[PDB]
Design a binder for these strands. Structure first.
Ligand SMILES: Nc1ncnc2c1ncn2[C@@H]1O[C@H](COP(=O)(O)OP(=O)(O)NP(=O)(O)O)[C@@H](O)[C@H]1O
Ligand SMILES: Nc1ncnc2c1ncn2[C@@H]1O[C@H](COP(=O)(O)OP(=O)(O)NP(=O)(O)O)[C@@H](O)[C@H]1O
Ligand SMILES: [Mg+2]
Ligand SMILES: [Mg+2]
Ligand SMILES: [Zn+2]
Ligand SMILES: [Zn+2]
Ligand SMILES: [Zn+2]
Lengths: 193, 41, 340, 157, 175, 341, 154
DNA sequence: GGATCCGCGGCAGATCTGGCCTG
DNA sequence: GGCCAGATCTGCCGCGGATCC
């Protein structure tokens, strides 16, 4: 038995479904014979492992918004690409907190970026902040983050989230550039325009 | 419910019949007592 | 027509000397295994009826059986005798030896037995055979037509089964016989039904009828032509008078699937009585009627109706465990018959 | 061996097990007293106002709930399922007419079984859940009547 | 090549049939002939002899995800409108978006007064597509309708999911 | 064994709510066309028996579904049986779940007596052989398997013989592998069965009763097959085997299908049924339920008195007829309703 | 269309198929057009030179000192898959039943008689039907006439 | 007294209803 | 859904009993 989130749904031509899940112990891939997206679920795997039982633990009803759904898919994909087994116990609570924030907060982008920066920091891809950040390094090239943006980024990377929220109340572009430099292109990047 | 799961698990020593019987015994105190008596017997 | 006297010697377990039934309704009373059925069977045989193996009718440890009957019809009395044994039957009419076909002309008698229920609750073959023999009892052309049709069908099937050949004359013969057989059957059944309906209405409260199903109602030739492919495939003739079906109906429903014991018994008795009435109206004088075990599986009303109907016949003999009320009665004890 | 007769009868009486299945279970439990004792030691481990079974005269629904909403349930399994659901704050047939007092909307939580259909027809504010298509899966794994009802039950949005 | 083709069909029966086909050349040739003989309507999307189906040779329109769904609907018998067949659903994970669908082909057939049934999948992705198409239609001045959410026929309560039951409740109707 | 309650809905012409027979001897009284036979047939079918009537003709005229329900308790415990008769076919629900019909074969069940037994006693050779086969088949399934295998082997060998030539000794050995087993089983069963029948019939009449089974192949199938090659070649069919045995019932040392009256034949049929009931009750430990139809129709006073005496010592039995036996509880049937005063 | 009709006829004709299954697979292949030509190309190994069995190459894996006789290739693969033993493998034409006219000549008994050399044991793995038992008896009689100790599975 | 024929019991082969297992 | 078990139905062959010359 394991507990995790649903971050990947690949339909199988034979009527089955390919499932992609991450737990506090590491990411995994599973299949089912013949559980909705972005749901915290507790499941029992049998071995690609074949799922046998699944228990629902909560629904995020507010994710049906188009932009909110796109941002949640972006966050989940970035989490999965950063879902190392060692970092999984750190990312999983961060994943849940970010999903709750983007579900509840009026502006999903704020908690989205708040969780994404911390996931990037904890996933071994922490940018070097020592006005434009390029490949995770500040300088005269890249997206102009500005003094306020740099200060908010430093506060988020150093202070806990509670007082990091007021500072951030453009960094998304820098985080996307850093993630692309570290890991390569993103499949979901086409959606946003 | 804890006693329900304990009963379904003892009965499992399929799950749908185990559940139907656990529910029936919960809803029939007399029969369940008689069964505990016969098991002690 | 009156049966004045009847004698026998060494026939089953009978050990009597003479029996003189009175005119009108009569009765017989006995327990189990006493000889009512044997007496009725002997009376039926003595008048030239049909039956048990011919070698099984002789008493145990004997070889010769003798039956003698004296009947005084309207025109004049005459005698009959029968000899049974290893050689065979020796029927002589009033002293002169003669064949049974001569006795076929005489009225004879009608016997009602528990064996008539199978003509109602039995399979298709039994019903068809019963109808065939019932029609044959009235006419002589029917037997010859049936024999010729059977032989022609056998020849045609034998030729068709073993490979192929020219099938032109066999079809013509089969059609020529079937077209007459079907017409005769229709003509007889057009008249038989109303008498049966009236008799059953007298006996009971429901309604009875007959239904005949014909595979070739317009012509044997066309029916044969319209099935050649499957006839050649299967290898048997699939049309003709030898595949018709007869069904007895109680309130518009088949009798062999819904009727009970009492209804079936009443229907069989009605059929026998209708046959008796038709024979009486045909030959010239009604034959003697013999009813065996008349009132077991019937209630009070049906028994009373049966007795009331039988009260009006010129002569009849009833046998059973219980004596009917208000009629002369004779008892049977260990094969002997004694009368008051 | 006369003692086992009562046990066999007791297990025979419950639905879903035949007399030979009960005898087989008793025989399997006769020489396996280990788990028989384990089961015996593990065994230990309705209010008029509601109709709900609970320890004590008042059920937890009676024991933060409103009397405005009352839902009629066919079986207590559905009651447990809806308790695991938790979407009504309100309290939880032939006797419906003389329970109409104090009720301003009637909630129909009965299943769509033919018995429920006949009961609803006999009983004919009152509300009933709609007929529509479920969530997830595949449109090719459905039934024709549901397709037709969803096409004719199509709502405007 | 044979084992994989036989396994693509929706084990032991597949193998026995492949062996029989190997031992029965004529049947295999007949099957290849039927396949060549078999080798979507421009407007409806169903099957057709040549270009247009017999039906084509209309106030109602039904949006559908795939041809199989279209045919299922037609088998239902409760729809005599026209159809527009998309190429699939939106999927960022598969790089599917406005630049991949037949939106522009859709807009060539749509008019002001019309109703478009929203027969998308019952998933997060199908719901997102449904809402997106509905918004695009309300912008472009056309009615938006959605099939009823609720319990399926012959469904038991015990085994229904909490979302289905919650939608049934929220969408309860007077009677 | 004891029956407690029987309920029905749309079965034949019956129309009633419930029927609770008392423990012990019972009775039924009714005129013609009332439903005694229908009630007994319904009980027999509910308790898991086999009804000769067709399935589609057991429902009312107009309706399309029937329901049966019985509540029986045994030495082990109570349980409920339920049948859903309809267009699709029979289905059984023991205590609430679907159960295969073969499972009820292990239950006690019941035995039914009807004039069909009387017809079978006085029937041709094939009917008697079929009756013996069906009687033996209720005590073992190995017999049915052996019969099926023997029939298949016989068909194969006959088809081979009808045309052409091929290897023949193989099929001979194959058929002889089963013929001997069938013969041995029949001999053992008859040896165990005869004395019970004799002692049962000794309490209903005065004469002697017995059985006889003559065999075409006593020493062995192979020896008899090799001794009739010319006849097989001339005819073209197998002429030796268990499929040509003859069973004869004897009254005072004479065949019963040529020297017997109605009363004696009916007594023989009843004796056979009672002996089967006793043997089955000994086999399963708990005797089944006995249902008699038309108990005393074609019998005299002494035989009726003898019949009533024997049935008084049974656990539970139900008799039906047009008259009420003296000194027993009586229920009446009128147009389908059963009322007990 | 008529092409769909003939495709459904072809699917129904082949064994182990349902008419409803045939129709649903016809509609599924109408939905998937690439799988059509994929199956067509995958549609297009011969008899072994020595044994005569179907061989992935030049000899069947049986050839490449225990001998067994089997009705058909299906039971051959079923027996080899479990892999209790390895030895020479032989396959017959079928069973031996005279109802539909299959005698010893219609079978491949003649081929089996060419390679008895070097054989010390033969086991008759045959089905449990009566035809299988008759075939086993005939084979045992023939080999005993030639002379080889034989065994059969329990 | 021999011989052809007519009718019926007995048996094998083909059809058909209702229950079952595999999936 | 698909294959088998078991009862019912139809036609052919050898045997017994009536008739003829
Ligand atoms: N060939 C025979 N020789 C000597 N006795 C015989 C012969 N055939 C029958 N019996 C005896 O006659 C009895 C049958 O007599 P039967 O005429 O049938 O009686 P029944 O009065 O009609 N009896 P039931 O019909 O049972 O009420 C047999 O049981 C034997 O005892
Ligand atoms: N399927 C049916 N639906 C309705 N009525 C029926 C059906 N089958 C038979 N019947 C009637 O039921 C009656 C027969 O019932 P039955 O149970 O045989 O009577 P019984 O009491 O045994 N009579 P009996 O044996 O003749 O003295 C007749 O009136 C039939 O017409
Ligand atoms: Mg008599
Ligand atoms: Mg009756
Ligand atoms: Zn309460
Ligand atoms: Zn079109
Ligand atoms: Zn090889």
């Amino acid at each position: 038995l394991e507990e995790g989130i649903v971050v990947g749904r690949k339909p199988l031509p034979q009527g089955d479904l390919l499932l992609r899940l991450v737990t506090p112990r590491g990411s995994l891939e599973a299949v089912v014979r013949k559980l909705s997206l972005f749901h915290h679920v507790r499941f029992q795997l049998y071995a690609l492992p074949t799922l046998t039982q699944a228990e629902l633990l909560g629904r995020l009803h507010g994710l049906e918004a188009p932009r909110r759904f796109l941002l949640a898919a972006f966050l989940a994909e970035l989490a999965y690409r950063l879902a190392s087994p060692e970092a999984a116990p750190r990312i999983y609570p961060l994943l849940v907190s970010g999903l709750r924030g983007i579900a509840k907060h009026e502006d999903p982008l704020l908690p989205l970026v708040w969780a994404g920066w911390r996931v990037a920091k904890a996933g071994g891809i922490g940018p070097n902040l020592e006005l434009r950040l390029k490949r995770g390094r500040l300088g005269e090239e890249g997206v102009y983050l500005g003094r306020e943006g740099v200060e908010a980024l430093k506060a988020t990377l150093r202070l806990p989230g509670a007082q990091a929220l007021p500072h951030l109340e453009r960094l998304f572009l820098a985080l996307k550039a850093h993630a692309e430099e570290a890991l390569g292109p993103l499949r979901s990047a086409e959606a946003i325009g | 419910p804890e006693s329900l799961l304990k009963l379904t698990r003892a009965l499992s020593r399929g799950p749908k019949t185990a559940q139907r019987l656990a529910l029936h015994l919960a809803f029939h105190k007399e029969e369940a007592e008689a069964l505990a008596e016969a098991l002690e017997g | 027509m009156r049966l004045l006297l009847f004698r026998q010697r060494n026939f089953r377990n009978l050990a009597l000397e003479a029996y003189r039934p009175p005119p009108g309704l009569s009765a017989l009373v006995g327990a189990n295994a006493q000889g009512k059925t044997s007496l009725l069977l002997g009376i039926h045989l003595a008048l030239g009826g049909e039956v048990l193996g011919l070698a099984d009718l002789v008493r145990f440890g004997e070889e010769e059986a003798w039956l003698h009957a004296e009947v005084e019809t309207e025109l004049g009395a005459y005698r009959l005798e029968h000899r049974l044994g290893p050689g065979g039957r020796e029927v002589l009419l009033n002293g002169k030896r003669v064949s049974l076909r001569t006795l076929w002309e005489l009225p004879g008698s009608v016997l009602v037995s528990p064996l008539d229920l199978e003509a109602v609750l039995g399979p298709k073959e039994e019903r068809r055979a019963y109808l065939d023999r019932l029609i044959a009892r009235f006419s002589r052309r029917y037997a010859a037509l049936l024999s010729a049709y059977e032989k022609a069908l056998r020849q045609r099937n034998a030729l068709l089964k073993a490979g192929g050949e020219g099938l032109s004359a066999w079809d013509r013969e089969l059609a020529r016989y079937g077209d007459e057989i079907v017409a005769l059957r229709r003509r007889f059944l057009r008249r038989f039904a109303p008498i049966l309906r009236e008799v059953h209405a007298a006996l009971a409260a429901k309604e009875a009828g007959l239904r005949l199903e014909e595979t070739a109602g317009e012509g044997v030739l066309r029916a044969l032509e319209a099935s050649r492919a499957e006839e050649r495939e299967r290898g048997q003739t699939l049309v003709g008078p030898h595949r018709d079906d007869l069904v007895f109906l109680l309130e518009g429903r088949p009798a062999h699937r819904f009727a009970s014991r009492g209804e079936a018994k009443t229907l069989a008795l009605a059929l026998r009585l209708a046959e008796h009435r038709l024979l009486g109206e045909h030959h010239g004088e009604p034959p003697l009627l013999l009813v065996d075990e008349w009132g077991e599986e019937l209630d009070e009303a049906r028994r009373r109706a049966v007795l009331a109907y039988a009260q009006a016949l010129p002569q009849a003999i009833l046998a059973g465990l219980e004596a009917p009320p208000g009629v002369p009665v004779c008892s049977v004890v260990r094969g002997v018959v004694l009368c008051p | 061996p006369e003692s086992l007769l009562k046990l066999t009868r007791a297990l025979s009486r419950l639905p879903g097990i035949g007399p030979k299945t009960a005898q087989r279970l008793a025989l399997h439990l006769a020489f396996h007293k280990e788990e028989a004792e384990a089961l015996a030691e593990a065994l230990e481990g309705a209010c008029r106002e509601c109709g709900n079974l609970a320890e004590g005269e008042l059920c937890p629904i009676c024991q933060d709930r409103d009397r405005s909403l009352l839902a009629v349930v066919e079986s207590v399994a559905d009651l447990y399922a809806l308790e695991r659901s938790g979407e009504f704050r309100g309290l939880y047939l032939e006797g419906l007419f003389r329970r109409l007092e104090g009720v301003e909307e009637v909630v129909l939580a009965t299943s769509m079984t033919v018995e429920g259909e006949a009961t609803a027809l006999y009983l004919a504010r009152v509300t009933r859940p709609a007929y529509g298509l479920p969530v997830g899966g595949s449109l090719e794994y459905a039934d024709e009547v549901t397709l037709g009802r969803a096409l004719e039950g199509r709502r405007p949005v």
